[PDB]
Amino acid sequence: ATLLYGKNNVLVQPRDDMEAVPGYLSLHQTADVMTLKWTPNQLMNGSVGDLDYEKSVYWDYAVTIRLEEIVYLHCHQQVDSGGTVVLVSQDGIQRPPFRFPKGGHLLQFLSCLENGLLPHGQLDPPLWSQRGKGKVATDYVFRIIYP
Amino acid sequence: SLFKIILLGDGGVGKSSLMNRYVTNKFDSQLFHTIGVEFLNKDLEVDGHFVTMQIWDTAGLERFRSLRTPFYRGSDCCLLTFSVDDSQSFQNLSNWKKEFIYYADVKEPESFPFVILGNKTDIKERQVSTEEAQAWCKDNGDYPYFETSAKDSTNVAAAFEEAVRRILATED
Ligand SMILES: Nc1nc2c(ncn2[C@@H]2O[C@H](COP(=O)(O)OP(=O)(O)OP(=O)(O)O)[C@@H](O)[C@H]2O)c(=O)[nH]1
Ligand SMILES: [Mg+2]
């Protein structure tokens, strides 16, 4: 079990009325199986107490997804802002976007995702390709492919 | 090949700021304690060696110890960081070195490359003097010492390059 990517302060907003919750986003590979996790900060930072830890409201917000369940990544990178990505799953379940902090974190995540899918999988179109630099704000759609 | 470099040091000494200054040439004044681990890649050439370094940023806070220690293993060089305006962070250097050795399980601990950074050198009101820091470095393994400022870039690149240089030296 190895860590391919980690990023603090990835926000997710469970509903549009309530403010975004900051959390840690990680990519992990155990064998050839990649899994994406997002965990609200209060569950990492030890700020719930032993007795409440097992049934905290924040456990309802934690996500863990096997990458093979993902068919599309629909990314959105506004200038002077943080990128968002929506994972589109084979099951059709609506998932809230992850929002990255300002900077090139979106691309970095896409890059570690790509580096890890190899050699059995890859992003389509490739990150290095002309199509892979999105279309103009900026909008990306990637498919995960297994040759 | 791939040269893994890890930043350790008390909360708030400027570990994240150093990585971001070196990799992206940017500085943020904002307060946020790193919780989970992160890394960035950077390529450069050193003494005619073309190299990929992977810089691992970690939580400095005592309470977040279990979130950083699993990633000590496999490190090629450790950047132990303190802030020159924070004597406590300086006094913690030994404990940081001890902690790394314990969790990284390195065969030869007194051969292992450390590089020591006294960050925030742009702050004139110091609590640690240069000679004091130089003296500690010499009496605890004869490590390279750099006075750095992530805010104004002072010696930031020099420090990371020396880390690669130290790694290159140990491959023998
Ligand atoms: N004046 C000055 N401030 C700095 C310098 N480096 C970092 N800071 C500031 O000090 C604070 C701490 O910065 P961080 O990089 O987040 O410290 P850290 O070591 O990464 O802290 P932890 O995540 O808690 O382990 C922030 O407000 C930074 O802007 C510096 O070189 N000079
Ligand atoms: Mg930090």
Cα separation, B58 vs B72, in Å, equals: 10
CB atoms within 10 A of CB A109: 24
B32 inside 8 A of chain A by CB: yes
CB pairs under 8 A between A and B: 29
For chain A positions 21-60, those within 8 Å of chain B (CB to CB) are 24, 26, 41, 44-46
Task: Tell me how many domains chain A contains.
Answer: 1
In order of start, what are the domains of chain B with their CATH numbers? 1-172 (3.40.50.300)
- What CATH number is associated with residue A26? 2.30.29.230
Amino acid in position A98? F
Give the residue carrying structure tokens 């930031």: B156
A103 inside 8 A of chain B by CB: yes
The residue range of the domain holding A125 is 1-147
Elucidated via: X-ray
* Ligand 1 probe mutation, B7, B10, B15, B17, most atoms within 8 A of CB: B17
Pairs from B61-66 (Cβ < 8 Å, separation ≥ 24): B61/B11, B61/B33, B63/A45, B63/A46, B64/A45, B64/B33, B64/B34, B64/B35, B65/B99
Resolution in A: 2.3
Q: Nearest by CB to B36, which of A44, A104, A108? A: A44
Cα separation, B39 vs B37, in Å, equals: 7
Q: Which residue has the CA at smallest separation from atom 15 of ligand 1? A: B14
B73 inside 8 A of chain A by CB: no
Dihedral (Cα; B24, B29, B35, B41), 10-degree rounding: 10
Which two tokens mark B28? 């943020």
Crossing angle of the two packed helices B156-170 and B15-24, in degrees rounded to 10? 90
Ligand nearest, relative to CA of residue B11: 1
B67 inside 8 A of chain A by CB: yes
Return all residues near B142 (Cβ < 8 A) that are at least 6 apart.
none
**Min CA distance, A93 vs chain B (Å)?**
28
